[PDB]
Amino acid sequence: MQKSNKINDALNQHYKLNVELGLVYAHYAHVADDEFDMPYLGKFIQHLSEDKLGVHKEYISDYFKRNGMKLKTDVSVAVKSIPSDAKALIQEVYARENEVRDHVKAIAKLALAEDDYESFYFIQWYVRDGLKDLTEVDDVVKLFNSSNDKLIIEATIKAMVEKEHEIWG
Amino acid sequence: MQKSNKINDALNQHYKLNVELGLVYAHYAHVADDEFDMPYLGKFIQHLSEDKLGVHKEYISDYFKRNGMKLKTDVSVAVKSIPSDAKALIQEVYARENEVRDHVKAIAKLALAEDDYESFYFIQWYVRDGLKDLTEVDDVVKLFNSSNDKLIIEATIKAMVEKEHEIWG
Amino acid sequence: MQKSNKINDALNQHYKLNVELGLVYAHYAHVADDEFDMPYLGKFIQHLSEDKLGVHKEYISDYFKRNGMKLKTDVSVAVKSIPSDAKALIQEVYARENEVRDHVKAIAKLALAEDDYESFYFIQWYVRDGLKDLTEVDDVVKLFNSSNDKLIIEATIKAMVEKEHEIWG
Amino acid sequence: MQKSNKINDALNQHYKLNVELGLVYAHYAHVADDEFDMPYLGKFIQHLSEDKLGVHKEYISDYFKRNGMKLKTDVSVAVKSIPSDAKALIQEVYARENEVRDHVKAIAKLALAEDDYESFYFIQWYVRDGLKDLTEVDDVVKLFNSSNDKLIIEATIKAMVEKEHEIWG
Amino acid sequence: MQKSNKINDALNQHYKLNVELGLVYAHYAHVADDEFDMPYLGKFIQHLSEDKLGVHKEYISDYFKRNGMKLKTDVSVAVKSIPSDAKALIQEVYARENEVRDHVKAIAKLALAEDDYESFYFIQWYVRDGLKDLTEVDDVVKLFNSSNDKLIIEATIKAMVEKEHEIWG
Amino acid sequence: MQKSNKINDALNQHYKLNVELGLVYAHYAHVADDEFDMPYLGKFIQHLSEDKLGVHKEYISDYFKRNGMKLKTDVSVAVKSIPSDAKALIQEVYARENEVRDHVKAIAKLALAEDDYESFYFIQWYVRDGLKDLTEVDDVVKLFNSSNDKLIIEATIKAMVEKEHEIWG
Numbered sequence A, B, C, D, E, F: 001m002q003k004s005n006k007i008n009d010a011l012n013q014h015y016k017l018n019v020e021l022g023l024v025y026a027h028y029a030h031v032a033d034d035e036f037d038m039p040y041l042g043k044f045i046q047h048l049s050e051d052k053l054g055v056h057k058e059y060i061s062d063y064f065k066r067n068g069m070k071l072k073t074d075v076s077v078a079v080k081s082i083p084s085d086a087k088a089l090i091q092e093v094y095a096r097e098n099e100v101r102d103h104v105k106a107i108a109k110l111a112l113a114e115d116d117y118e119s120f121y122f123i124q125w126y127v128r129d130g131l132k133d134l135t136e137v138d139d140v141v142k143l144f145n146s147s148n149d150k151l152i153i154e155a156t157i158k159a160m161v162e163k164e165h166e167i168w169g
Ligand SMILES: [Fe+3]
Pocket: A039
């Protein structure tokens, strides 16, 4: 029952993505309140940072503990340019989340090729949260194309944060 | 991360099946009480109509909202012949439910061929409810081969309706 | 006390209307969230779909069970064109609801001509829900002529859905 | 929708494994308290016996009831040699549990080759409990390499038994 | 106070009987629902399987722990033929239960011949459950000679399962 | 009331330290359970990771929001060598925590030199948590010099984690 080295590497790379994304999203959350004057958009993005630098990363380490796989910590992230407005900050988050979806799909395809059924099971969480976290992000992006008032958008975000689907929750 | 057109079509066809089945099952529920004098068999079939014209159909539209897929509404259903007895009405429901199982299997096979792992996840609900809803139907069919009294059968159906397995519930 | 064949036909046609309307309204609810970015307008229209494909249809079948009338299921519905904006989607719903009012009036007139007093009683529910469901729809249509912000309108719809008159409730 | 004979056989063989393992684990639990003077290690192994001779076996029979598959009961188990110490008794349990993992993987691979998506769904429970039950076992094995006192180990086992992960629980 | 080798052997043989009976009764419970369409008769027989493969077996191992006796695990059971109907399945269970009574009597006679008063005490539980478990079984057998309807019998079994005498409970 | 650029830089460097420390401590927590077989030592170090990558980092960004200071995200961390035992893993954490104390002292000295009294106030939290978090770490280090049993140490850590001083809490 020996562990696939290719999955270890793909999952160590997913650990990295999640760590680094959450570190950018912590900055973007700072920028959303500070520069863009939108406190609740930052709360939304802070909650994403904490999801990524949290359960998304810890589930990988736990799996590794159980399967014999090794953890690798190599992190390199710099926020050197910030988007111009808040619409674009949330659109950037989206872009990154759609990319998470593409990476997760690759781990699933590999698990099936390596006949690792425990890794395919493990990734099913990530297959689902991929669409979910993007759906959440899209719903905020939508708002910026539905109002020209930042204060109306901000109140809609409030309620969204101050709120589980049977398939995707 | 662009959507498979073949899955959209298979899932738009599953939406249609569920809409149309529930419309037949609403008729069959009417017929079970009206013509066949079995009120609780109709309650069982009304509950199936409502499952199909409900969650089975709405989960598809929600997925579509999230993935970029399009909804299509083309419905054509007519109940032109009704079964002769109640045993046969429930046996007809069974037949249709075993066919749901075969259709769902095809969506799963395609998702794996198209490498759509989010659609394979989505269909896992339907893989499971396929067997479940058939199991429920079979359990009523069984009754008609275990009694010659419609009133005993009816009381067994009562209790069954007036009632979640860890794998299939 | 033998049943009027003309009322059976008018009520079998009303069953059809309600089934088919609810199937269009389920699509329109999908479109209101998906394309038009208005989640709560779709919840409003989903609630209408469920009313029509529910109590409006089931009360007819129950009556039929009691009076000797026959149910007919012949459904043909296709959504081939969708309105351009959300104002027009709700204005289309209105149009269809004002037409329900005209059809219900015809069943009432016929019942009185056929001296079916039980059908006139039965239709009194529909006489009342006709104006009610239109009033509800008009109240949403009004909003689109009172704001240019989709997000303000959406919050007014929220509260309206997240809410019985002594004559019309 | 006709049942795969190869899955029936693989699942009838898994039924056998679980029955026979639980019968050995009931003996090993006896031996852990009686000969090895470790009451709580036996409680841990008695709880495994009961899991195997319980839900692991009953879920297979239930599935069979639903899919048309046949149950086969052919059991042959003898405990003819017992390990020398308790470290080795738990290490033997581990070995057997890692083998369960390998067998479950084979059922999954076959289900995908036979295009049995309901069997792949069914086995997902077993894919998960495979790693879980091994993780539990490893955690006890670990203790024997962390203390030379059987009474300290025994108290750690106590607390472990006298205690659900979102992916593996 | 040294242990009788003859009682150890008789009680190791009783352990075997109980293990093997419960494994047949688990099959028969499967067959009662699956083939014979009687879900509650199988629940009754599943409850017997669990009694035998449970307390009947564990009390022997516990005694052994206390008296110095050895446990032996040698199990060989195959279900190669199933009864034709449900009356006969329950009549087969009866036969096997009346045989339990005869075996238990022999352990008691031996204990008194070996002057093992602690084994005579221990067996008093089994002397009592022998008649009890047979009484329960007879009460179900009776039903099959009192109705020709499987659905009436099934409802009587339901209530019996969904239910302690001062001497036999 | 214009912000000191030197404090911004020192506090942006403290943000970096805390992010990077928590990422190493997440690895070390993995290693403490996985390799060193000490689950509760890892829980202790996971709790430190979360403190650092949490409140220690967020309080800096909040301050920045209020004072006009800029956030900088430049992270570079790699775990390339792991300590040999668990005593040394906790001794490494200590070393790093005593270094936090030295860095915090420097921010305080600078604030007083720059006459930034709001930054001196802000740092008072960090002056205090410096000694506290080290005290906590020392208390675990102590254990490894007080027992040779990893399982006794582990139970002492359990209780410590499963547990506010008026000056340092
Ligand atoms: Fe604020």
